[PDB]
Amino acid sequence: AIPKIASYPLPVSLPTNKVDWRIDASRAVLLIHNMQEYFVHYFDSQAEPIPSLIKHIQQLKAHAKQAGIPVVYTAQPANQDPAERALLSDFWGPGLSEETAIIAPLAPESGDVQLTKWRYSAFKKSPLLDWLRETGRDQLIITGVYAHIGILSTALDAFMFDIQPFVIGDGVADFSLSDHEFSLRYISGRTGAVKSTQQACLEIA
Amino acid sequence: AIPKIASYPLPVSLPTNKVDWRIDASRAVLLIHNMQEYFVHYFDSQAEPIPSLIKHIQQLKAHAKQAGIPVVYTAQPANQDPAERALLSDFWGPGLSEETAIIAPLAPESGDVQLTKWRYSAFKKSPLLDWLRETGRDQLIITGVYAHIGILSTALDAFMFDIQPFVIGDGVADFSLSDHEFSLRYISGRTGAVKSTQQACLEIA
Ligand SMILES: C=C(O[C@H]1C=CC=C(C(=O)O)[C@@H]1O)C(=O)O
Numbered sequence: 001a002i003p004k005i006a007s008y009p010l011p012v013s014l015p016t017n018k019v020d021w022r023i024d025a026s027r028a029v030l031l032i033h034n035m036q037e038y039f040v041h042y043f044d045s046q047a048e049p050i051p052s053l054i055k056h057i058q059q060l061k062a063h064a065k066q067a068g069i070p071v072v073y074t075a076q077p078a079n080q081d082p083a084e085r086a087l088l089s090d091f092w093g094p095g096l097s098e099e100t101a102i103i104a105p106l107a108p109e110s111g112d113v114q115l116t117k118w119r120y121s122a123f124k125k126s127p128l129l130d131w132l133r134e135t136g137r138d139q140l141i142i143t144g145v146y147a148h149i150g151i152l153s154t155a156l157d158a159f160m161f162d163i164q165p166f167v168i169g170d171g172v173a174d175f176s177l178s179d180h181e182f183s184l185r186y187i188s189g190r191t192g193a194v195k196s197t198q199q200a201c202l203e204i205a
Numbered sequence: 206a207i208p209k210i211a212s213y214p215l216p217v218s219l220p221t222n223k224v225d226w227r228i229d230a231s232r233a234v235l236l237i238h239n240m241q242e243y244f245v246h247y248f249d250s251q252a253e254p255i256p257s258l259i260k261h262i263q264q265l266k267a268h269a270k271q272a273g274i275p276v277v278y279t280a281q282p283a284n285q286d287p288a289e290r291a292l293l294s295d296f297w298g299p300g301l302s303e304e305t306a307i308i309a310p311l312a313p314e315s316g317d318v319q320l321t322k323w324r325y326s327a328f329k330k331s332p333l334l335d336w337l338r339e340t341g342r343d344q345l346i347i348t349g350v351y352a353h354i355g356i357l358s359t360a361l362d363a364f365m366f367d368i369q370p371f372v373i374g375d376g377v378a379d380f381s382l383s384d385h386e387f388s389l390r391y392i393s394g395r396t397g398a399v400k401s402t403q404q405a406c407l408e409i410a
């Protein structure tokens with residue numbers, strides 16, 4: 001199951017990157033990954049890391065808009081058909097039946113694309129890759145939950161599809177600080193660049 | 206870079222699985238992943254974990270053959286075009302130029318398929334998924350190196366493509382015992398079943 005997640009502080013220190021990539025507003029898309037009521041409610045939303053996570057994603061979204069970076073959301077649909085949900089059910093059960101809305105502080109606006117999420121990777125069973133390729137966007141800024149699961153899997157697919165992933169270290173959260181930090185170390189070492197919210201904002205500008 | 210890998214003992218204790226899946230010879234394919242001279246030579250092949258790794262993979266291959274389970278190998282090609290190698294070069298450099306052969310103790314036979322490996326996941330830029338689907342094989346037994354990189358990424362893709370991954374805990378190796386054990390814990394918790402060589406052999410029979 002997803003645990004009841006004990007409060008923990010968002011990390012400030014981030015791993016060093018092996019790559020020198022920088023976010024370019026002409027190349028990038030901002031993904032807000034699985035910030036649904038369902039997933040967020042495994043935390044106490046009034047306790048760390050959630051207030052600061054939300055603030056950081058809000059800020060990045062506002063800066064993205066100002067810079068002309070498209071924003072895309074992922075969200076799982078309720079009551080997934082067992083044949084379509086497939087092997088996920090063997091790990092997580094039948095899945096959400098409610099609480100599908102994106103949390104209000106991160107409400108999608110009319111021009112923000114909302115993709116249906118079927119697997120850990122946002123690319124699977126979705127038009128994400130075709131859209132990025134059609135529009136010539138080859139950087140994906142990744143925020144949301146959970147760092148070691150769909151954030152990581154989406155970054156791996158992006159990387160393998162020749163899209164530079166930028167995972168925002170204080171713009172994701174996870175089941176624990178340990179899982180969160182290990183995820184960032186894995187990403188920096190193997191499959192993307194990790195940036196702070198402040199650094200990503202500076203690069204976007 | 207891939208480190209010069211210090212000797213370490215293959216783990217015997219394996220994590221518990223969340224799933225109750227069992228290998229079925231009518232459903233399964235055995236993947237021997239990146240057991241090329243190039244990758245193996247980052248270890249001392251005469252020191253643990255390599256002699257036991259090789260023995261275990263040899264045994265599984267022989268049992269697979271006896272049980273009618275197809276065997277498939279992956280191998281990276283030498284001197285990859287930078288445009289095709291893409292973002293990998295930013296993490297690992299230009300990649301191998303030599304040492305492309307599968308190590309002799311695991312020599313492919315005439316009926317064993319050899320796929321060209323382009324990304325961490327064996328599915329990317331390959332016919333693997335189409336072949337599995339065409340032939341109705343929906344279990345993938347995974348052996349080889351490195352546990353936390355291509356073994357993990359291949360398992361993630363298989364899982365997301367509705368193929369049950371069985372990662373052989375004492376049939377893979379990695380940059381360190383810690384990386385190896387963490388990989389197995391991740392897999393058992395999130396994206397496949399971990400089996401010992403002995404257990405996989407019993408299930409195959
Ligand atoms: C927020 C995520 O959803 C996954 C994690 C746990 C449970 C899940 C489920 O019930 O389907 C999702 O697959 C993520 O991909 O990180």
Ligand SMILES: C=C(O[C@H]1C=CC=C(C(=O)O)[C@@H]1O)C(=O)O
Nearest residue numbers: 239297300325350351354355356
């Ligand atoms: C044995 C693997 O190759 C990868 C790991 C390190 C260096 C690699 C390279 O130079 O391309 C591979 O991407 C694996 O996928 O686990």
